[PDB]
Amino acid sequence: DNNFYSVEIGDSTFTVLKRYQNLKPIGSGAQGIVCAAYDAILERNVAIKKLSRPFQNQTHAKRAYRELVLMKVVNHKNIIGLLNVFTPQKSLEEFQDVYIVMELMDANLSQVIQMELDHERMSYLLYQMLCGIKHLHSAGIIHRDLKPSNIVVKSDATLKILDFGLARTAGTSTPYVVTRYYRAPEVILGMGYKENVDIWSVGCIMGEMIKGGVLFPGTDHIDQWNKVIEQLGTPSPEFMKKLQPTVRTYVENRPKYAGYSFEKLFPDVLFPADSEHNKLKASQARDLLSKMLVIDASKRISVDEALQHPYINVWYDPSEAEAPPPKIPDKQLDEREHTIEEWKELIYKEVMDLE
Amino acid sequence: PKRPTTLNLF
């Protein structure tokens, strides 16, 4: 009879439109288990992300709202596409679950990191990640959690970013929320953050792609800092000064480190043959690597700079790279405290709009 | 320099 239905996936219940069929578990977001599904109507695979009673908490509601808002507003071929949203509940009183339907790519980067890319591919993927990020920044939005598993590819070599639950404007104003291995110094050390925090993440991702494995493993949130300095060497005192004193003391206390050169961090052995023409060179990759993986955010290259970089700009196209900003209605401001129930209200209104 | 159009996820 009715519009929705139900399937047990392990201990999770998916209640979804009858159009969606054959659900399979695939992964998680900050919030959400996610299923792959057939959309019998549109006749294509999709991804359904269940957000479970997200109003149950400041956190969950904050993240859910953003994710709802940003997914509606964002539009770029390198951001993952909105397709549908719904709740199966029939009212603000009944309400508990949100569901988001998105396009399904073929794989996340996990994945590619292991295979051995030629330069044109490696540079192309980066270029696509960056246009994606420039799209968010373009509107003041920082992704904060870029990592191989938030970046999805397809076998035509296209690429999109994913999961906006973490996404907000600039820093300070909780610490262990961004994935450990991709944490920038400004995040490890508690000093707050600007858009180029995303650039640090890209640097790590690129590094891994080449490295074959995680660039700064780091066995806990503190060792993490060791890995960073073990490699890049001890930041400047100019830098340390901006460190809060409690943390400043620890840092200044570490064994000093010269740090390896990028040629040593990233030898030729590791790179493919150099490509047909000029800018896709192992050394150009190094140069770029060296401008992203910089401890001091104020000496770190931006997205627009990164797109300009000779290794990335060989694909440069203004209609991808200088699109119109997603438009955020000044209502939603990624920070406000609401309540227990002001939240349940907001999301509902927002899902309601979107159904 | 052409954009690749294949990517092997075998």
Q: Where are the domains of chain A?
A: 1-106, 107-323
DSSP B6: -
**What is the Cα–Cα distance from A127 to A205, expressed in whole angstroms?**
13
**What is the Cα–Cα distance from A231 to A215, expressed in whole angstroms?**
9
Q: Do domains A1-106 and A107-323 have the same CATH topology?
A: no
**What is the Cα–Cα distance from A32 to A108, expressed in whole angstroms?**
17
**What is the Cα–Cα distance from A25 to A9, expressed in whole angstroms?**
7
Long-range CB pairs of A226-231, under 8 A, 24+ apart, other chains included: A226/A254, A228/A185, A228/A188, A228/A295, A229/A254, A229/A257, A229/A259, A230/A257, A230/A259, A231/A259, A231/A260, A231/A265
Cα dihedral A184, A172, A244, A180, rounded to 10, equals -30
Which residue(s) pair with A35 in the sheet? A25, A48
Number of A–B residue contacts, CB under 8 Å: 36
Closest by CA position to A292, among listed A306, A282, A279: A306
**What is the Cα–Cα distance from A312 to A279, expressed in whole angstroms?**
8
In degrees and rounded to multiples of 5, residue A81 shows phi and psi of -90, 135
SS3 B5: coil
Token duo for residue A343? 């939240």
For the stretch A142-161, what's the b/e string if a residue is b when 16 or more beta carbons lie within 10 angstroms of its beta carbon?
Answer: bbbbbbbbbbbbeeebbbbb
Q: Cβ neighbours of residue A8 under 8 Å, at least 6 residues apart?
A: none
In degrees and rounded to multiples of 5, residue A182 shows phi and psi of -115, 0
CATH classification number, A107-323, choose in 1.10.510.10, 3.40.50.2000, 1.10.10.10, 3.40.50.1820: 1.10.510.10
**What is the Cα–Cα distance from A155 to A37, expressed in whole angstroms?**
19
Token duo for residue A50? 């269940």
**What is the Cα–Cα distance from A141 to A197, expressed in whole angstroms?**
11
Elucidation technique: X-ray
Is residue A268 within 8 angstroms of chain B, CB to CB? no
Token duo for residue B9? 């996820």
- If DSSP states are collapsed to H, E and C, what string results for chain A? CCCEEEEEECCEEEEEECCEEEEEEEEECCCCEEEEEEECCCCEEEEEEEECCCCCCHHHHHHHHHHHHHHHHCCCCCECCEEEEECCCCCCCCCCCEEEEEECCCEECCCCCCCCCCHHHHHHHHHHHHHHHHHHHCCCCECCCCCHHHEEECCCCCEEECCCCCCECCCCCCHHHCCHHHCCHHHHCCCCCCCCHHHHHHHHHHHHHHHCCCCCCCCCCCHHHHHHHHHHCCCCHHHHCCCCHHHHHHHHHCCCCCCCCHHHHCCHHHCCCCCCCCCCCHHHHHHHHHHHCCCCHHHCCCHHHHHHCHHHHCCCCHHHHCCCCCCCCCCCCCCCCCCHHHHHHHHHHHHHHHC
Question: How distant is the alpha carbon of residue A147 from its chain centre?
Answer: 6
Cα dihedral A131, A135, A140, A143, rounded to 10, equals -70
- CATH number at A1-106: 3.30.200.20
Is residue B7 within 8 angstroms of chain A, CB to CB? yes
Closest by CA position to A98, among listed A153, A124, A123, A61: A61
Token duo for residue A191? 């000093």
The answer to whether the beta carbons of residues A355 and A99 sit under 8 Å apart is no
Cβ within 8 Å, pair B7-A154: yes
The answer to whether the beta carbons of residues A324 and A70 sit under 8 Å apart is no
Resolution of the solved structure (Å): 2.8
Maximal CA-CA distance, chain A? 70
The answer to whether the beta carbons of residues A164 and A198 sit under 8 Å apart is no
Angle, CA of A73, A76 and A80, to the nearest 5°? 80
Is residue A120 within 8 angstroms of chain B, CB to CB? yes
**What is the Cα–Cα distance from A53 to A98, expressed in whole angstroms?**
7
Token duo for residue A344? 């349940």
The answer to whether the beta carbons of residues A182 and A175 sit under 8 Å apart is no
**What is the Cα–Cα distance from A193 to A242, expressed in whole angstroms?**
12
Residues in chain A closer than 8 A to B8 (CB atoms): 115, 155
Cβ within 8 Å, pair B8-A155: yes
Percent composition of chain B: helix, strand, coil (DSSP 3-state, to 5): 0, 0, 100
Annotated catalytic residue within A11, A97, A118, A145 = A145
